[PDB]
Amino acid sequence: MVQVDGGRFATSDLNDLYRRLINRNNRLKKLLAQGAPEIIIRNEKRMLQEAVDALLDNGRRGAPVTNPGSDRPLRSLTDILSGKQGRFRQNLLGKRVDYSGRSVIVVGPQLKLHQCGLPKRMALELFKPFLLKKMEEKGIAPNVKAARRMLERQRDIKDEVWDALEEVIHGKVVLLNRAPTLHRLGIQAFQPVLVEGQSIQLHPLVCEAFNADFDGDQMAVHVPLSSFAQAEARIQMLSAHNLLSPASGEPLAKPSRDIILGL
Amino acid sequence: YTGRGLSFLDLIQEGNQGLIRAVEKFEYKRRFKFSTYATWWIRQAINRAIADQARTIRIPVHMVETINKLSRTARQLQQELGREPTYEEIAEAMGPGWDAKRVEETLKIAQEPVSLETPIGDEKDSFYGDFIPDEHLPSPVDAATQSLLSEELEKALSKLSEREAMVLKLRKGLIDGREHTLEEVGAFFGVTRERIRQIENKALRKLKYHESRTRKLRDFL
């Protein structure tokens, strides 16, 4: 039962389900203590059973229980753990992650097969903890907290921050991803190249594997953090290492529309 | 009484409780029919139950009656003025002791909480709970700066003497967690209250001197 910034209270549907069960349980105790007739006791016991059913699994038996003033069924324990929006598929098999970005993709014809064009401003936010350490190491900032204040305001960012960011990303790779990820080539690791602008530059030879065109598609960027995560991406997931199709063994990074035409 | 926060069967069972009370207090000597005297107790039991069980955040009966009366007065003025009354018109019609501030506070109290599972948009894949941050647990940035400050403060306290460092860490609650006093620390070392404030002031002055000569501790403030 949380208080939002506006002062309003927001609560889950389980509190209403628990309250009904407690109200009916307490009333049954009072009726039993008063020696009420069997008809009254039987109706109260039947309601107590239905309150337990609604709490455990709402809508399985009978009319679903809805909050008064609306026709939306209350979310029970069973509904929490089941379905495409349940705990398993929404929070356990997949999650939202830190150190992740997204932007529009454009074609980079000058890139190497293992390179991508990462915007400077995305790279600054993605590699922020690494950047703060590097700024502290040099004379840019006295400590990390002072360094973080510098990056908060855009007009306070000096020109040596970009040099430090260039040093931070040296050798490291990022994961580019385009949804839907139909096969494992829907995630590929690239060595970022800092570019001016706001769009990610994608190599032409990897468009077929990503099933990406340049009519407004968007891609996600992920930063593996440890040496294991970097080693796996640089060795196993690198674009220049996955040239054949796992399905058939035929080339998957091969000359395409304009390249074929010129040759 | 349906549609006032309680389901039909809940109203019936609460009404049954009033019916049991009516039988206990009913007197047949007065030659009144039972339905005459039972109707009072059945309505009372149903109405009280609504006042007690219709809100997730319980509001006392006296305050519920205030809200009901305030709603009626606003409704009467609304149909008579041909528009929504302001808080001043409501307060004036309520009577003595009521001003616009009290009306606003009462209306603020009468606000039901909103469900965390209410969908937004035609697509049934977004809810209120997905847009409410958790502001209780410290963030990774907040945890890191707390540890950085602790590490820097420990290094600054190294320059102090063995006993001067202990006094400040006891008086500021850096050891047991809770602040001690001049007497309590005085019992720990066998010294009186007056000496401790002098050495603590001296030790604090030295920390100011060291911090001034380095400026390695001003960012955390």
């Binding site: 008809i39 039987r42 109706n43 039947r46 309601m47 239905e50 038996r61 009978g62 | 039909f8 069967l9 019936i12």
Partner: peptide, 13 residues
């Protein structure tokens, strides 16, 4: 399956 109908039937006896 309808608790209200079941209760009304019971009190009708």
């Amino acid at each position: 399956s309808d608790p209200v109908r079941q209760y009304l039937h019971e009190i009708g006896q």
